[PDB]
Structures are given as C-alpha cells and as structure tokens.
Write a protein that binds this ligand. Structure first.
Ligand SMILES: [Cl-]
Length: 276
C-alpha cells in the first residue's frame, strides 16, 4: 500500500465508513499461480453461477492455463511503480453518443472497456485509447495488439476456452457459439480472479442478484488497480433508454449496481460523466 499523489486517493480511509466497510485492500483482482487456490465455499459459489454439469478439475485447468498465459502477473498491474494512476472506465451506454468525451477519456493513463464495444468510428465520443478490455467467451471481439485482454470467467469452461482459442481451437460452443480462435497474444492475457468476483458480489452488491455484471466488475476492479477513476457510458441516456452507443430477469441487479456507482460518486471516490 502507498498513498497516491492525485488530488484524492481511492484508498484513503476515514472519508466514508460506507466505503471503508466494503473496500478490502488485501484483495487480488487477478489470478496468478501463487493465488489460485480457492477456498471451498468460494469455489462452490462460483460453480453455481452457470452450473456446468461436470466441470474439469480446476487445479488441472489452471495449471494448463498458466502454461499458456502469464502466471506471475502483478495482481495490481504495477500500481507500485507510479504515484498517481488515473483510469477511465468506459461502459456501453448510448448516453455516449454526441457526448464528445473522447479526448478526455484518452487523457487517462489506463482506459478500460468491455464486451464487444468498438472504438473505431466512435473515437470523438468514446476515445481511441484502450489499455485493458474485459471479455468472456460469449462476449468477445478481437482486440488491438497493445490491449491487455481481461478474461472474466463465470465457469470452468471459460478458462478452458482461453487455452483452446489461443491453441487448438477445439471449443466452438458453450451454451451458444463462441469464437474457436482469437488473435490476442498469449502474453497480453489477464484473468479476473474468481475470488474477486465473489468479493464484488458479497461486499459491493451485498448479494443482490445472481451475480455481478461486467459493468460493476469493471468498476470495482478499477478501484483496486487505480488511484483515480472516471466513469463514462454507465446507465441510461437522458430519455431513459438502455441502448448501446454503436448499434430485468434477476441475474443482475442493474438498479442496485447503479446505486453503488452513485454512492461512490457522492463520496468523490469516482467521478461520473453522464453523457447525453
Ligand atoms: Cl492464496
């Protein structure tokens, strides 16, 4: 832990007891060979998200995964080498349209994006820069060469997919078709820690919903990796519409998720850019 040199620091204690109760400095948001053993209850919970009939042994899968992708990444992505890390987290809302936020977005040290969201042809609004990009097998698009891919695994097969799609191309389906092959270089792949998913669900969502959305997973990841966090493209537009910029059930609690980001903004732990 080090205090940052930004105007404010996310880690700063005693600003908000609500914040101090939830934020856990000892959490590691990325999987490594050294941190990969899940406690029993964590592992059971994670298996219940999508309930694969009979998953391959997790230890086996992870051993194989780290023969492919790097197994000794710094879990905070070398935050300790800088004194202020400024991050933009850019969601998929149509509220980005005609917002003109691109240049401010690209002014950040890291820019974090998710799902199939394009920047090409939208740069004036969403920026041209990406440092990190959150995907899963059923929500992937090819990424520029300089972009770190963060796989968010919601079942054991998602880990097997990363191995397959960078090697043999044998996995072409989960419950829907998925890319058999991807072009991302192995050394640019990061794996969101399943225990970090549960931390977000338990501490930050307080168990609202079946499991956390990519949106809220990206935000809480950024609170740990960054010193300063600006959100873009979260929520509805000014007309109340939920449409993506480029084009309910109980599984996620979008209302509660949006309430978390709202509270975070109210305590200056993030700034929210609402767009149009
Ligand atoms: Cl551990």
């Amino acid at each position: 832990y080090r205090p940052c040199t930004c105007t404010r620091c996310i880690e700063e204690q005693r600003v908000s007891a609500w914040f101090d109760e939830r934020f856990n400095r000892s959490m590691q948001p990325l999987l490594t060979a050294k941190n990969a053993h899940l406690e029993e209850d964590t592992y059971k919970w994670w298996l219940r998200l999508q309930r694969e009939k009979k998953p391959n042994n997790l230890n086996d899968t992870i051993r194989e995964l780290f023969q492919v992708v790097p197994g000794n990444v710094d879990p905070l992505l070398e935050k300790r080498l800088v004194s202020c890390r400024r991050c933009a987290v850019v969601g998929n809302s149509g509220n980005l349209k005609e917002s003109y936020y691109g240049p401010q977005i690209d002014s950040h040290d890291f820019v974090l994006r998710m799902n199939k969201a394009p920047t090409e042809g939208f740069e004036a609004d969403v920026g041209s820069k990406t440092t990190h990009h959150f995907v899963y097998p059923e929500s992937f698009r090819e990424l520029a060469q300089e972009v770190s891919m963060i796989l968010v695994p919601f079942k054991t097969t998602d880990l097997e997919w990363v191995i397959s799609a960078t090697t043999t191309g044998r996995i072409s389906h989960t419950y829907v078709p998925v890319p058999a092959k991807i072009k991302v270089k192995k050394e640019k792949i990061l794996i969101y820690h399943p225990a970090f998913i549960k931390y977000v669900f338990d501490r930050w969502l307080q168990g609202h919903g079946r499991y956390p959305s990519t949106g809220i997973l990206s935000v809480i990841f950024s609170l740990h990796i960054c010193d300063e966090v600006d959100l873009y493209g979260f929520g509805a537009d000014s007309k109340g519409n939920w449409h993506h910029y480029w084009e309910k059930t109980g599984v996620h609690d979008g209302d509660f998720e949006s309430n978390v980001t709202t509270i975070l903004a109210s305590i200056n732990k993030i700034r929210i850019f609402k767009g149009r």
